[PDB]
Curated annotation (Swiss-Prot), chain B:
One of its GO terms (biological process) is ribosomal large subunit assembly. Part of the 50S ribosomal subunit. Cross-links to the A and P site tRNAs. Interacts with assembly factor DarP(YjgA). SUPFAM superfamilies: Ribosomal protein L16p/L10e. Keywords: Hydroxylation, Methylation, Ribonucleoprotein, Ribosomal protein, RNA-binding, rRNA-binding, tRNA-binding. Is hydroxylated on Arg-81 by RoxA. The modification is nearly suppressed when E.coli is grown in anoxia. The lineage of its organism: Bacteria, Pseudomonadati, Pseudomonadota, Gammaproteobacteria, Enterobacterales. This is Large ribosomal subunit protein uL16. One of its GO terms (molecular function) is tRNA binding. The modification N-methylmethionine is found at M1. Belongs to the universal ribosomal protein uL16 family. Binds directly to 23S ribosomal RNA and is located at the A site of the peptidyltransferase center. It contacts the A and P site tRNAs. One of the last ribosomal proteins to be assembled in the 50S subunit. The simultaneous presence of uL16 and bL36 probably triggers ObgE's GTPase activity and eventual dissociation from the mature 50S ribosmal subunit. It has an essential role in subunit assembly. InterPro entries: Ribosomal_uL16, Ribosomal_uL16_bact-type, Ribosomal_uL16_CS, Ribosomal_uL16_dom, Ribosomal_uL16_sf.
Curated annotation (Swiss-Prot), chain C:
InterPro entries: Ribosomal_uL5, Ribosomal_uL5_bac-type, Ribosomal_uL5_C, Ribosomal_uL5_CS, Ribosomal_uL5_dom_sf, Ribosomal_uL5_N. It comes from the Bacteria. The modification N6-acetyllysine is found at K2. NCBIfam families: PRK00010.1. One of its GO terms (cellular component) is cytoplasm. Keywords: Acetylation, Ribonucleoprotein, Ribosomal protein, RNA-binding, rRNA-binding, tRNA-binding. It holds the Pfam family Ribosomal_L5_C. Identified as a multicopy suppressor of the slow growth phenotype of an rsgA (yjeQ) deletion mutant. This is Large ribosomal subunit protein uL5.
Curated annotation (Swiss-Prot), chain E:
Changing N104H: In PW095; partially suppresses a rimM deletion. Belongs to the universal ribosomal protein uS13 family. Part of the 30S ribosomal subunit. Forms a loose heterodimer with protein S19. Cross-links to the P site tRNA and weakly to the A site tRNA. Forms two bridges to the 50S subunit in the 70S ribosome, contacting the 16S rRNA and proteins S19 and L5. The lineage of its organism: Bacteria, Pseudomonadati, Pseudomonadota, Gammaproteobacteria, Enterobacterales. GO terms for biological process: cytoplasmic translation. InterPro entries: Rbsml_uS13_C (IPR027437), Ribosomal_uS13 (IPR001892), Ribosomal_uS13-like_H2TH (IPR010979), Ribosomal_uS13_bac-type (IPR019980), Ribosomal_uS13_CS (IPR018269). This is Small ribosomal subunit protein uS13. The keyword tRNA-binding applies. Keywords: Ribonucleoprotein, Ribosomal protein, RNA-binding, rRNA-binding, tRNA-binding. One of its GO terms (molecular function) is structural constituent of ribosome. It comes from Escherichia coli (strain K12).
Swiss-Prot record, chain F:
This is Large ribosomal subunit protein bL27. The keyword Ribosomal protein applies. GO terms for cellular component: cytoplasm; cytosolic large ribosomal subunit. Keywords: Ribonucleoprotein, Ribosomal protein, RNA-binding, rRNA-binding, tRNA-binding.
Amino acid sequence: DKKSARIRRATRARRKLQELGATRLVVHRTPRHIYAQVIAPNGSEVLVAASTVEKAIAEQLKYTGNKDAAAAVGKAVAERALEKGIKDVSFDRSGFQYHGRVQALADAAREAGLQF
Amino acid sequence: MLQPKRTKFRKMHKGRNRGLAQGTDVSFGSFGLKAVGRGRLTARQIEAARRAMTRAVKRQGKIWIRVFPDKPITEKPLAVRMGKGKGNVEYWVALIQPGKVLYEMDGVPEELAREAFKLAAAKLPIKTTFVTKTVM
Amino acid sequence: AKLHDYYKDEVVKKLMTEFNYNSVMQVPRVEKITLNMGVGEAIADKKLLDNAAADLAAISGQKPLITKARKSVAGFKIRQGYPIGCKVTLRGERMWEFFERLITIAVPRIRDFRGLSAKSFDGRGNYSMGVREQIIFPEIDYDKVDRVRGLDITITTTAKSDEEGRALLAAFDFPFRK
Amino acid sequence: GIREKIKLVSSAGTGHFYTTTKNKRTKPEKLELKKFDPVVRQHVIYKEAK
Amino acid sequence: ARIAGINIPDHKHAVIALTSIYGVGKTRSKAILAAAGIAEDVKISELSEGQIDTLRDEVAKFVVEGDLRREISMSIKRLMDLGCYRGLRHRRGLPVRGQRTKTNARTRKGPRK
Amino acid sequence: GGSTRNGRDSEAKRLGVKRFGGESVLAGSIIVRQRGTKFHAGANVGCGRDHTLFAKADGKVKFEVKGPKNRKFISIEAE
RNA sequence: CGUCGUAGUCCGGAUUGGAGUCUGCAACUCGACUCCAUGAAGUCGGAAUCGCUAGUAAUCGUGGAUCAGAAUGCCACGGUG
RNA sequence: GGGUGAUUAGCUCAGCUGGGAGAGCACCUCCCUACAAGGAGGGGGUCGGCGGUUCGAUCCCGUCAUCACCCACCA
RNA sequence: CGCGGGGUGGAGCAGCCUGGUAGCUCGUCGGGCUCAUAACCCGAAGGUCGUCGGUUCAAAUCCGGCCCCCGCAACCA
RNA sequence: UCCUCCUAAAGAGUAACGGAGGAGCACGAAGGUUGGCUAAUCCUGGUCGGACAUCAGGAGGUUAGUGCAAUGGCAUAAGCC
């Protein structure tokens, strides 16, 4: 199953983020929904989040899994992280390959509040 | 026959023989022979002790033995001026300490199990004890 | 594709209560058609095998390549990285295109057509379904009188039993056991 | 006695050489490698066994 | 062009891929060439333009392979399905014609290395 | 040759005890080639090519004593 | 007269096969005949070696006994020379 | 008891970047005449066995058999 | 950093210093000859020279390299 | 001379001409990095098909693997594409 293959692509990146500290952006996807959440340097708390499951984000879309839906989460999480003063961070991609929908989220954040 | 598969590490060293053994209650039959002393047994000595029991009961019982050798002995034909290397292996040995059960039987009466285990006592380094199933 | 959707539209789904299944997700499907070629131990001239691989690439939408053995120590006293076959396997749009000329007709060349066994076991419902020998297709530079050739046809399925594979196989031109 | 010891020279020109070993018994092909030197400050491929 | 064979004449006469096709022997393929208006003059290997059609109509008039012998799927039972000594020798590498085995034994059914 | 030449065992084991350090570096057990159980915390990494245990800090060590398998991590805390 | 220009050949025939025709107490086994289907080996041959006289040698034809049927064995008769 | 080596076709023996084993004799059929010598045609071995190492073992590793040698210990 | 020569059909060795032209002697094989085998005799088969470039109209033949293989000697940690 | 595991004692050092075995070099790659991938071996059916390698299915091992030996780490792969 793809989840059991995805953790095999994430455990080294996560063990190395455990050396870097600070907040993680936790960018995650499924074929129907896109997600991001700012989690603390200890994992005990989440500061702010964004996803294509939110009432107003989900209706202002043609499909909640599209590149435009990943960009909508990028603009939301960057606005919400800029409200919390977040800057000078790295990109955590939850075991996913960065091309396509994960990059469309990263470019939407660029002029919205977050650059890597 | 009465040796483990060969290894490149066959020149095993003597340890230090000590007390306590976990295996003490019969598990193959209703009558058995227990060490109640400490020492060592050779791969020919255990078969000579089995043969004395075999000749006492013949067909009237099957014999079990909990013992198969775990170390060789390194040995040389005569004393030497010291010295070089470590000698070659010549015979195999098993270690015994007091709580250990050694042999078991079931198909015989108790008075014949006592006789068969008496007929081996002069081939052994320790003064053994008779064991029964003893269930309430 | 000419014929393809039929194999998930109604195939076995019309009979799934003979198996007391309730969801169409409990019903078998085809995954792929593997193919395997008889290599004839050839090594010293090896160009007739490259031309038989060009005739395998004439019936498969794949690039012709080589397969390895899994063992590097074996009772066959094998060498390292040993080339053992070719596959040239069909899935999706290339499998539905292969169904237009293969596994559908063999009578344009005959001698008896009643002989040969037509059996398989797997316990999970995967099959060996080839009916043997070729009719040869009209092409160019194909007058080489090439000898000792074989192509074995196996199917991979989503089935859960030996009889579910035998029920799915009915959707193809296969003669079955007497 | 089975390997050669060669003198490779910079594609930017050097009186000096880069010192390394090479095959002489089963490979006729050449050895070429990028290296730095503070007289040209460019990091350049060293080539041909002089 | 392919009408009955699987082979092509390169330097040999026009009887190649018209003879030995499992239905037409050396005497009958000669008669088919004459019936198609083809002559043996200058040892032809490549036919004239459209001349294959006049030849095709004659070789498709003869029976081949599974039509030359068209009941072998039924004639098999008296040979392989019941007890048959005429078959049992064949499946032991032996003939059934009254063979002088002290002369003809050769290699194909047992060496002779 | 061939000959049984045995070789020498060379140091390893411990260098000191309790919460050590306070000058420039946190030098742990001097056990070479070891990557099984004794490690530095990700928050304060060190170690060299040979995996000999140390952590990059001028203060005093603390032990985390918990983690995966048998991991206990040489760590730092401000006093 | 027609034809190949030297090709494993329009060469070559053993085998694997079909369907009919005849005799006979009876032909699966251990026969002949016919018309057809597949068509290998063989490219003039180890150490070497046989024969010869004038209508003869050479070579191509014809007949007959053994039979109900059945020889490349057996015995005989012409052309050309 | 301990140690160094030899064992490859019916015979004597070559054969280690180990990789699917070979010649000369001999023998069969023959030539010559009924044989010898020898010319021509032709076959191949658990590489003494067992059990391992190895991509591959006749060869390396531990052992048993068959065969030869080294030793009863310096004063 | 120092040393002379060879590689020619299957061996052996000429030919190379004459640029244009392949040789001697064995072996291998076909015939011829005989009471065996063979020997001998008369013929035949195998050749742009280890190999890659350069000089030139033209390279076995003149020059530079790489590999196989064998002598000799000065400085050489 | 050097080196992996052990004698060696809940620091080191260390016995003896002690037990099992390596190094004196090789690959400009097995170095640097991005991303992907997942490993003994066994059984059964189907075949080319000479037990078993293969094609697919079922079972099970991070005991597979690493330029070299040893020992431990390791799929988070430092293992191979």
